[PDB]
Amino acid sequence: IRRFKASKFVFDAFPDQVAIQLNDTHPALAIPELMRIFVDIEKLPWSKAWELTQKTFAYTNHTVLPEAL
Amino acid sequence: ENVAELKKSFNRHLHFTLVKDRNVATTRDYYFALAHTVRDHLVGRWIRTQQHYYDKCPKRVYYLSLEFYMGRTLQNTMINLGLQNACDEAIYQLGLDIEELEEIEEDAGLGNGGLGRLAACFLDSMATLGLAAYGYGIRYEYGIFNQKIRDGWQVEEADDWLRYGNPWEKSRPEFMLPVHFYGKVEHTNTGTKWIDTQVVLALPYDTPVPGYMNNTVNTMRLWSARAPNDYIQAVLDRNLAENISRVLYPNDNFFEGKELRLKQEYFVVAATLQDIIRRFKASKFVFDAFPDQVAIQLNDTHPALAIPELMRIFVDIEKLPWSKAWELTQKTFAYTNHTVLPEALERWPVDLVEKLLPRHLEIIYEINQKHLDRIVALFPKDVDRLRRMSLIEEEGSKRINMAHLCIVGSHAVNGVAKIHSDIVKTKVFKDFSELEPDKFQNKTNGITPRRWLLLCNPGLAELIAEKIGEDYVKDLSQLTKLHSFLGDDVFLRELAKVKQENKLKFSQFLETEYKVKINPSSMFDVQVKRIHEYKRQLLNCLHVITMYNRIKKDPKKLFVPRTVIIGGKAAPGYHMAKMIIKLITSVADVVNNDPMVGSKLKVIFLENYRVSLAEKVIPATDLSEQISTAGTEASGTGNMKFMLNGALTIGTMDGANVEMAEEAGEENLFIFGMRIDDVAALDKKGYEAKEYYEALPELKLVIDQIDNGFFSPKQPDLFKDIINMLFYHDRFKVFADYEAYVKCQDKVSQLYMNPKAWNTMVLKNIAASGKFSSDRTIKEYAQNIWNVEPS
Amino acid sequence: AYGYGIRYEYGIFNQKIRDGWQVEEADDWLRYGNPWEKSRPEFMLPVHFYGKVEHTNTGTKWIDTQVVLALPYDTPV
Amino acid sequence: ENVAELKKSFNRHLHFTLVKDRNVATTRDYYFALAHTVRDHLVGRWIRTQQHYYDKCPKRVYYLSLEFYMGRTLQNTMINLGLQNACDEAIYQLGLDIEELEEIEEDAGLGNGGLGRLAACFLDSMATLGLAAYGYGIRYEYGIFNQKIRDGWQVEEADDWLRYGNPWEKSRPEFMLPVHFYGKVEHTNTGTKWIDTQVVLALPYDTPVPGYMNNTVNTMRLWSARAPNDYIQAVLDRNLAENISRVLYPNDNFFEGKELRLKQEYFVVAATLQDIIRRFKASKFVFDAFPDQVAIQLNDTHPALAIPELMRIFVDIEKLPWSKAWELTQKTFAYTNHTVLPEALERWPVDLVEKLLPRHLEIIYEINQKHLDRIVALFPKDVDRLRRMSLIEEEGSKRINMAHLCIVGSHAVNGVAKIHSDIVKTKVFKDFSELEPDKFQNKTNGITPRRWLLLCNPGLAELIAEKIGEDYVKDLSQLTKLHSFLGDDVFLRELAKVKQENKLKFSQFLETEYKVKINPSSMFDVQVKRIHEYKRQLLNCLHVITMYNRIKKDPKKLFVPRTVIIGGKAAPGYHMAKMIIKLITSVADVVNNDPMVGSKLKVIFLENYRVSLAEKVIPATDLSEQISTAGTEASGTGNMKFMLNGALTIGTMDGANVEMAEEAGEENLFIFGMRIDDVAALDKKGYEAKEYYEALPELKLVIDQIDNGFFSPKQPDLFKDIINMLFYHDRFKVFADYEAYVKCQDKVSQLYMNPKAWNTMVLKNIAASGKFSSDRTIKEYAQNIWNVEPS
Ligand SMILES: O=C(N[C@@H](Cc1ccccc1)C(=O)N1CC(C(=O)O)C1)c1cc2cc(Cl)ccc2[nH]1
Ligand SMILES: O=C(N[C@@H](Cc1ccccc1)C(=O)N1CC(C(=O)O)C1)c1cc2cc(Cl)ccc2[nH]1
Ligand SMILES: O=C(N[C@@H](Cc1ccccc1)C(=O)N1CC(C(=O)O)C1)c1cc2cc(Cl)ccc2[nH]1
Ligand SMILES: *Cc1c(COP(=O)(O)O)cnc(C)c1O
Ligand SMILES: *Cc1c(COP(=O)(O)O)cnc(C)c1O
Ligand SMILES: CC(=O)N[C@@H]1O[C@H](CO)[C@@H](O)[C@H](O)[C@H]1O
Ligand SMILES: CC(=O)N[C@@H]1O[C@H](CO)[C@@H](O)[C@H](O)[C@H]1O
Ligand SMILES: Cn1c(=O)c2c(ncn2C)n(C)c1=O
Ligand SMILES: Cn1c(=O)c2c(ncn2C)n(C)c1=O
Ligand SMILES: Cn1c(=O)c2c(ncn2C)n(C)c1=O
Ligand SMILES: Cn1c(=O)c2c(ncn2C)n(C)c1=O
Ligand SMILES: Cn1c(=O)c2c(ncn2C)n(C)c1=O
């Protein structure tokens, strides 16, 4: 977000400047964290924040074994 | 609340309220639709807040002022209500540009400058602090005039701010009241009666005042004059009664004894006091508890008549005995002094007052008699002390010294900055403070960080919140936490980036309004405030010409480029201020068009400086000019706005500048020139302007250029009035601070050449600006004067 | 593209075989220094843990948190 | 070497080493680029010097210490290498401020105070004298904590000095060694074996020690602890072995028997001795020549275990017979005693030692047995002599008297100032010196004139060189030549000017860090050292309040204005020292804000006193406070720094103050108070604090103010612990030296009123400071203890 704000490119263009790949679910918290920053801190409305979030993240599943979920 | 519902309301108002659809709706229609959409969000809390004050009955605070320099209301309301982001999104989705809609709104310019803007910041702070406070003033049909520049001179145009309607006001017809004028006094056996008076009605209009994020919505009540009840001529003459609330007197720090101004002062006062007493009698709380339920702050002496008026009501009407009435009165009123300049003192001739307000003249004479009887009893031999402490000056044609009336009728008197409050207490009113030491106080001015940070500079507010949370919004002292980033390189670049963006956005504004091309790389040197000889934009102008000559003498020399901006309105009848404006536009013409200076230096006279423009230019400033002659600016508040927004200050040790230095560290401000005591020394010795002209070669060249027509070729003697004033009548010693000022200015450019050092000083200024929140100022008034408590 | 992860002091353990079984030993890969990493101290950031939520009229606030700093190290690719 | 090449290297390091360019480089990056640029200049000579010691094989000196209070390295390196002027020029040309770059460096604060700083000065001197010397200690991850003051109290913060990297250290992985703990002893037929021990690795880091202008670059080797080789928990538990070299114990002159401290002591000792033996076996010089090739100085008893460890290696490992091993051991070790205060004596309970170091306990018991067998054979009837001379105190729970172990295992024992060395020899260790008269010596402390004159006070160094050449740098006794200028008026003004400049520059520092405004005209009265009851900054505080009352009683009286500065860190668990700090900040608050005193007196508690701050404040001092109770400060070194830098001394006849008086002439110092014998008299008679409180009216008022809450209104009983200690438990007789101290202080102000007389005395102090160069101290150690020769 900090690198985004310095790009001299508010957060509407964020998903056009940023793509974040979640390697398995280990970094899953990134989703609610991006929402927390957009909402609690940047004061963006939830619907807008949720839209930007989905356009930002992509998830890669690496296994179907139950013990690994 | 959310986006979908905001869009729905917007469309609903565009339809039923503006009677339009998307293909015929005007920009103004869209602004009004959004305004009503936002306004609807205030209602519930406005009603609850006022209901709450009636239920729990806390002590109320009434801020009585002839001025309320409110600016625009839309954005301020969205922000304090936490609605801005949602509305921005909704308007964007409707395919509209919210910025354009916001520019449609007229400023409510019901003030001249500092005094009126302080009243506005106080209302925001009192609502944010949850105080049961009310602002009381006049609803002028026309506020401070719109300024135009024609052929280099100021031209005035009527500020018809209500022409298209004000969605932010609510007529309160059921509270209309009659106000009396002229007539005569009759001393009957049933009490003295004031009779055969002319009556003018007072219609109150309420404007909501939202606290920052707290469910509190207070009220600002402004009165409008209306006529009561050859036929045609008689109907047209109704204009005469209505002229009372027609126009704001356009004078800043200057007294003009016009009868109409006297009518306005009594008008606000009479309508206000009656309304207060009426609300008091309905509180289901005889008048013994009045001072425990009411506090009335007199904003300068303009509403001084409130004192004899309260006495008139208690005595002539409520039949209370004088001593009892006088006791309640003093406990009710507190007075705020806003200036020490002689030309600004209110001294009404007794003849005018006798004609317009016969009964008040009698009450004032009575107050004065008891007053002097006391002094005579304490200092029997000091006959001149009586002359000095009287409410009446027989010094020629008798007049009433309104400041003295405010002092004897008030339990507290305060100045607006330490240096000022001290001068008021120990010099100007020495005789009074000596008698009542504890009566005089200080309450350093403040500005609201909502409008002057969150609203006007979202980039900075966000950057700061990023680093230290949002607690600072309601506790500005929290900005000291910013000190942890002094060595933080990345943060310093981020800070500079925010200033750069503000400058870019403002430069766009400048290029479209003015012919000039702006070097966005230049240092923005800014002086915006009312045009005054004491504020000395003339000195600033001397330095500008000085830099000009330097570029002409040695074009290839390394020089930090500047964009010099000077703006402010001159009172219509202030000739010297008008000459000074013409001098600046003339100088700018030469400078901006000399191919040799080019992008090295650009000069701009910022037209129509007012609250909404201040919100644009301040966030874009690097250097803030606060150069009044030591001892002339009681406090200043523009100085504070600039400090809060990332600009460094070049100024004299005057007013609150002194406290900005105490907080940030004198070395983190570019202080210069004579100090209060040096100014006195020069006065004692006698100021000989010619000596500096003689001894300073750069000064002499500037002066000669001005006087010979270098800047006015088509008319060589144009600036003769300035030259003569400068050499023989400069009460503000422009030449005497010239040398130090220019040296100081050179030091500024030096620091500017070092970005990291510059932003390091900026950070220390911002981190130390917390004392200047009006929230702190109000807490002090509540605790030491009104005796009320934040909620 | 940028890779973002954690700079573990110890990576996947070194495996030894003792009497036919796996034995684990600490993988102290940074003991002698890693010339391939470049500390970027100017980009250090605070990360929050624990604390509690407060739903104020200025937005929900997460407070009384414990803070741990995050120091980024860049490795060229 | 020259400017062009230095700039080129700087840019090269900024690029390849910091991976930056001029627009993204941080201040820290620039500091690191310069550091590497300077560091490169050390390499060639570092390699040659160490190669030379291997080739010519001179006898080596190993200074074993738990502390090395090094301060910053950049400037010290540039100076000793003759590179400062060139680097200053190069950095200036690159458009940078070398002063800013220097302030980025963290102090290597691996020491508490005098003891640790002496080790640092010794390294500089040994390198300047060309001795084959090595400093051996621990590389603490965290040094002495950073001190903050919050609400008047000391707050501790971790000193994370290595967070950004230390360019001045060089890991030496190929010399890592294993150190053993716990386990058990087995007495086999192949020699006693120490088994089942836990192992912790010791990784050495070398830091170059440049001699002043001589091509010699010695080494300081500091060891860091590392772990050898549920899985996760096991990995995390590696922290336990690594905690050994984690933090410096923050105690100055105070023993704390924590097991972790015992682990640190054995850790340094074990790693150091092994490394020494290994280097000895590679010298291509069996162990008979060991003492002719090795000298190990024990800095206080902290590294006492080195003795039984050397025995353990010779016996258990090298299989040498005990008698032979014991002989070699004594010839190897020399011990330096640094204090006589009881609370600072190291007495480890035998149980802890038995658990952690079973084999060393056995070796110590053995040493003790042979020791007492001798005494029994010499004084058969003196049974108590045995009790007094034993290495074991059965006085309750058995403990090891480490000082006694250092004495029997060393061939030389020395104190650090004549008065101290005498007390050690004839009183504290009378039984031992009686037996071995020639074993006890004196080696008066010293300070290095590079860091403490050339570096910290360039103005003075230059002025002096101007008059007498530069020979004084390496032969400080040369300062006596300054006596030729006693009547030289011009020189005396030049001297005062240098002090004035230092004061100006330091005042700037004070105003930006503290709210206070500094009267640059005032006398800088300074007391900086660790907060202790024995150093008595409490007495200083009594005098401050005393001057305060005087100004309040008679404001218009002629008074020499002062700026009183007191600074130093309190050990975290030293409650009284923390109360004393709070007392000083409280007093300062009242004083600095009383409008009546104003610029007459300012008080400042100097925060975070450490080596780099000492280099700033000392050169700016006029009056140096050295007021410890007679007989409590073994030597002192701050006293010497102040003398060398142009300050006069107010102090007791204690430690080296006595020798400063011998050299300069007692009348040229403001000596006062009880002397060693008077203190004993009062002890014999019994100290009754109340008597002075009763008899001295100024003292009584001060005390009452403190005890009643004059300085702590919000909490009247705050300073109760101090009052009680002062009246019933003041081991340091604060009240008993109060009268003479204040009288003495008055005499100081008198002299200060006479500039010429003051600077005349200053000149006599500077001209007589030559004896206090650590170069002289080291020559004495080399000649009379290590038997090595300067080169
Ligand atoms: O003027 C408002 N409503 C209007 C509603 C209205 C409009 C037209 C005729 C009668 C009533 C109002 O009360 N009047 C217009 C009339 C006049 O011109 O004097 C009287 C209003 C609603 C409101 C709600 C908030 Cl939160 C703040 C300010 C507000 N003003
Ligand atoms: O660590 C590098 N330089 C070093 C330079 C340095 C060395 C010693 C002390 C301070 C700075 C560095 O920046 N630091 C070591 C410190 C630490 O361990 O925290 C910080 C480095 C340069 C470089 C260049 C490329 Cl292309 C790739 C990786 C790189 N690392
Ligand atoms: O640490 C130096 N060089 C560095 C060089 C280096 C840097 C990164 C990876 C491997 C090697 C060094 O030897 N190491 C950093 C590693 C660690 O973190 O343990 C080991 C160094 C060079 C030098 C030269 C002088 Cl004159 C004085 C002190 C010095 N230190
Ligand atoms: C704040 C403000 C002022 C007062 O400015 P000073 O420089 O303090 O005189 C005047 N006019 C406007 C529009 C302001 O916002
Ligand atoms: C020299 C020095 C000391 C020792 O000072 P004394 O006054 O001799 O106790 C302590 N701390 C620092 C940082 C020093 O430089
Ligand atoms: C009469 C008048 O307008 N006084 C003005 O009041 C404001 C608000 O207190 C001050 O900041 C300013 O210095 C002063 O000139
Ligand atoms: C235990 C300890 O820190 N002792 C200190 O040693 C230094 C260096 O010898 C002396 O100057 C000082 O007086 C003494 O208090
Ligand atoms: C400030 N001020 C005015 O505002 C003014 C004036 N004369 C007329 N006006 C309106 N003068 C002389 C003046 O000093
Ligand atoms: C508009 N205007 C003025 O306002 C003015 C003036 N000369 C003095 N004043 C004030 N002139 C020539 C002028 O054109
Ligand atoms: C006997 N035994 C086990 O039975 C065992 C083991 N590791 C896992 N198991 C189950 N090891 C190392 C081992 O010696
Ligand atoms: C010097 N000193 C200390 O350093 C100390 C202490 N108590 C705890 N500490 C740490 N005491 C009583 C003490 O005299
Ligand atoms: C921080 N601090 C202390 O460090 C302290 C204390 N009382 C005693 N001490 C040591 N108080 C009240 C305190 O706030």
Q: Whose CA is nearest to atom 22 of ligand 3?
A: D170
* Tokens standing for residue D119: 């080790």
Helix, strand or coil, per DSSP, at residue D96? coil
User: Among all ligands shown, which has an atom nearest to the Cα of D719?
Assistant: 12
Of B347, B529, B543, B562, the catalytic one is B529
**B169 CA → ligand 1 middle, Å:** 7
H or E element at residue C74: strand C73-74
Which residue range is the domain that position B440 belongs to?
A: 2-446+774-789
Residue C58 to residue B82, Cβ atoms within 8 A:
yes
Q: Resolution, rounded to a tenth of an Å?
A: 2.2
C-alpha distances in Å from residue B550, one per residue of B274, B450, B547, B740: 63, 42, 5, 17
The DSSP secondary-structure symbol of D613 reads H
User: Annotated catalytic, D530?
Assistant: yes
Q: Name residue B199's beta-bridge partners.
A: B180
- Determine the residue among C27, C36, C38 to mutate to test chain D binding: the one whose Cβ has the most chain D Cβ atoms within 10 Å: C38
| Chain A residues close to C60, C-beta within 8 Å | 40
CB atoms within 10 A of CB D50: 17
Ligand 6: does its nearest atom lie under 6 Å from the Cβ of B129?
Answer: no
How far apart CA B140 and CA B549 sit, in angstroms, is 46
Residue D238 to residue C32, Cβ atoms within 8 A:
no
How far apart CA B655 and CA B750 sit, in angstroms, is 27
Interface of D with C (CB under 8 A): 19, 26, 28, 163-165, 171, 173, 226-227, 229, 231, 235, 238
**Closest by Cα among D276, D205, D256, D327 to D62:** D276
User: Annotated catalytic, D535?
Assistant: yes
- Biggest CA pair distance of chain D: 89
How far apart CA B447 and CA B476 sit, in angstroms, is 11
* Tokens standing for residue D720: 């109760």
Alpha-carbon torsion, ordered D290, D293, D299, D304, to 10 deg? -10
In sequence order, the 6+-apart residues with CB closer than 8 A to the CB of B52 are none
Let me know how many helices (H) and strands (E) chain C has, helices first.
0, 6
- Residue C74 φ/ψ region, left for φ over 0, alpha for ψ in the -120 to 50 degree band, beta for the rest: beta
Per 3-state DSSP, chain C is made up of helix, strand and coil in percentages (nearest 5) of: 5, 50, 45
Q: Is the domain of D432 the same as that of D541?
A: no
- On whether D731 is known to bind a ligand per the annotation, the reply is no
Residue D597 half-sphere exposure toward CB, CA atoms < 13 A: 26
Q: Whose CA is nearest to atom 15 of ligand 5?
A: D611
- Determine the residue among C58, C62, C63 to mutate to test chain B binding: the one whose Cβ has the most chain B Cβ atoms within 10 Å: C58
Q: Is the domain of D466 the same as that of D606?
A: yes
Burial label for B458, CB within 10 Å (0-12, 13-18, 19+), is middle
Note whether D645 and D456 are within 8 A (CB).
yes
Q: Is the domain of D705 the same as that of D733?
A: yes
The DSSP secondary-structure symbol of D452 reads I
- DSSP-H helix ranges across D527-620: 537-553, 575-593, 611-617
DSSP per-residue string spanning A8-66: ----TTHHHH--EEEESSTTTTHHHHHHHIIIIIT---HHHHHHHHHHHEEEE-----G
How far apart CA D28 and CA B487 sit, in angstroms, is 9
User: Annotated catalytic, D338?
Assistant: yes
Residue A42 to residue B462, Cβ atoms within 8 A:
yes
User: Annotated catalytic, B729?
Assistant: no
Q: Name residue B202's beta-bridge partners.
A: B177, B225
H or E element at residue D684: helix D676-685
Q: Name residue C65's beta-bridge partners.
A: C50
Helix, strand or coil, per DSSP, at residue B107? coil
- CATH number assigned to the domain comprising residue D122: 3.40.50.2000
Q: Is the domain of D515 the same as that of D656?
A: yes
Residue B465 to residue A41, Cβ atoms within 8 A:
yes
Residue C57 to residue B470, Cβ atoms within 8 A:
no
Residue C61 to residue A40, Cβ atoms within 8 A:
yes
Note whether C47 and C66 are within 8 A (CB).
no
Q: Name residue B294's beta-bridge partners.
A: B60
Size of interface A-B (CB pairs under 8 A): 23
In sequence order, the 6+-apart residues with CB closer than 8 A to the CB of B240 are B227
How far apart CA B780 and CA B773 sit, in angstroms, is 12
DSSP per-residue string spanning D629-662: -TT--S--SHHHHHHHTT-EEEE-S-TTHHHHHH
| Chain B residues close to D508, C-beta within 8 Å | 667
Of D117, D530, D536, D602, the catalytic one is D530
How far apart CA D250 and CA D156 sit, in angstroms, is 10
Burial label for B382, CB within 10 Å (0-12, 13-18, 19+), is middle
Q: Is the domain of B361 the same as that of B432?
A: yes
How far apart CA D87 and CA D40 sit, in angstroms, is 13
* Tokens standing for residue D273: 């001795």
User: Among all ligands shown, which has an atom nearest to the Cα of D13?
Assistant: 2
**Shortest Cα–Cα distance, C49 to chain A (Å):** 12
Q: Is the domain of B762 the same as that of B780?
A: no
Interface of D with B (CB under 8 A): 26-28, 508, 511-512
In sequence order, the 6+-apart residues with CB closer than 8 A to the CB of D267 are D138, D179, D200, D202, D223, D225, D244, D245
Burial label for A45, CB within 10 Å (0-12, 13-18, 19+), is buried
- Which residue is listed with tokens 């289901």? B284
Let me know how many helices (H) and strands (E) chain D has, helices first.
32, 23
- Determine the residue among D229, D239, D242 to mutate to test chain C binding: the one whose Cβ has the most chain C Cβ atoms within 10 Å: D229
User: Among all ligands shown, which has an atom nearest to the Cα of B533?
Assistant: 8
* Tokens standing for residue B326: 């006088």
Q: How many folded domains does chain D comprise?
A: 2
C-alpha distances in Å from residue B658, one per residue of B626, B663, B745, D728: 11, 9, 19, 49
Q: Is the domain of B755 the same as that of B779?
A: no
- On whether B692 is known to bind a ligand per the annotation, the reply is no
Alpha-carbon torsion, ordered B263, B267, B268, B274, to 10 deg? 150
Residues in chain B: 791
Note whether D651 and D659 are within 8 A (CB).
no
Q: Is the domain of D675 the same as that of D765?
A: yes
CB atoms within 10 A of CB D705: 18
Site to substitute for ligand 12 among D154, D569, D578, most atoms within 8 A of C-beta: D578
**D715 CA → ligand 12 middle, Å:** 12
Burial label for D162, CB within 10 Å (0-12, 13-18, 19+), is middle
Of B89, B466, B493, the CB nearest to A45: B89
- DSSP strand pairing (B601-606 vs B440-442): unpaired
* Tokens standing for residue D249: 């114990």
* Tokens standing for residue D414: 């020395």
- DSSP strand pairing (D440-442 vs D601-606): unpaired
Residues in chain D: 791
Note whether D459 and D618 are within 8 A (CB).
no
How far apart CA D497 and CA D505 sit, in angstroms, is 12
How far apart CA B751 and CA B758 sit, in angstroms, is 6
Alpha-carbon torsion, ordered B721, B724, B725, B728, to 10 deg? -160
| Chain C residues close to B216, C-beta within 8 Å | none
Residue A45 to residue B465, Cβ atoms within 8 A:
no
How far apart CA B364 and CA B391 sit, in angstroms, is 8
How far apart CA D122 and CA D637 sit, in angstroms, is 12
Q: Is the domain of D728 the same as that of D628?
A: yes
Q: Provide the residue type at D140 as one letter.
A: Y
User: A–C contact (≥3 CB pairs within 8 Å)?
Assistant: yes
- Biggest CA pair distance of chain C: 66
What are B428-431's contacts with CB under 8 Å, separation 24+?
Answer: B428/B340, B429/B403, B431/B385, B431/B388, B431/B389
How far apart CA D326 and CA D368 sit, in angstroms, is 12
Residue C58 to residue B488, Cβ atoms within 8 A:
no
Chain D residue whose CA is closest to C24:
D231
**B572 CA → ligand 8 middle, Å:** 9
For residues B522-551, b (16+ Cβ closer than 10 Å) or e, as one string? bbbbbbbbbbbbbbbbbbbbbbbbbbbebb
**Closest by Cα among B660, B784, B781 to B129:** B781
- Biggest CA pair distance of chain B: 89
The three state secondary structure string of B462-524 is HHHHHHHCCHHHCCHHHHHHHHHHCCCHHHHHHHHHHHHHHHHHHHHHHHHHCCCCCCCCCEE
Q: Provide the residue type at D9 as one letter.
A: S
Q: Is the domain of B408 the same as that of B472?
A: no
Residue D512 to residue B756, Cβ atoms within 8 A:
no
| Chain B residues close to C58, C-beta within 8 Å | 82, 213, 470, 473-474
DSSP per-residue string spanning D278-326: HHHHHS----TTHHHHEEEEEESSTTTTHHHHHHHIIIIIT---HHHHH
User: Annotated catalytic, D517?
Assistant: no
- Which residue is listed with tokens 């600004």? B344
Give the pocket of ligand 4 (CB within 6 Å). Answer: B 113-114, 117, 529, 609-611, 614, 636-638, 641
In sequence order, the 6+-apart residues with CB closer than 8 A to the CB of D314 are D287, D320, D324, D325, D328, D329
Experimental method: X-ray
Helix, strand or coil, per DSSP, at residue B44? helix
Q: Is the domain of D662 the same as that of D701?
A: yes
User: Among all ligands shown, which has an atom nearest to the Cα of D71?
Assistant: 5
**D718 CA → ligand 12 middle, Å:** 9
In sequence order, the 6+-apart residues with CB closer than 8 A to the CB of B60 are B53, B132, B133, B134, B279, B293, B294, B295, B788
Q: Name residue D220's beta-bridge partners.
A: D135, D207
Neighbouring chains to D with at least 3 Cβ pairs closer than 8 Å: B, C
**B208 CA → ligand 1 middle, Å:** 12
**B730 CA → ligand 7 middle, Å:** 68
Q: Is the domain of B673 the same as that of B785?
A: no
Helix, strand or coil, per DSSP, at residue B690? helix
| Chain C residues close to B474, C-beta within 8 Å | 58
Of C42, C43, C57, the CB nearest to B213: C57
* Tokens standing for residue D618: 């000392």
Residue D511 to residue B665, Cβ atoms within 8 A:
yes
Note whether B146 and B107 are within 8 A (CB).
no
**D196 CA → ligand 4 middle, Å:** 81
Site to substitute for ligand 2 among C9, C36, C38, most atoms within 8 A of C-beta: C38
The three state secondary structure string of B455-473 is HCCHHHHHHHHHHHCCHHH
Task: Tell me the Cα Rg of chain C.
Answer: 20
- On whether B54 is known to bind a ligand per the annotation, the reply is yes
Burial label for B449, CB within 10 Å (0-12, 13-18, 19+), is buried
Q: CA B149, B151, B156 angle in degrees (round to 5)?
A: 35
User: Annotated catalytic, B338?
Assistant: yes
* Tokens standing for residue D578: 């923390």
**Closest by Cα among D790, D772, D764 to D637:** D772
Task: Tell me the Cα Rg of chain B.
Answer: 27
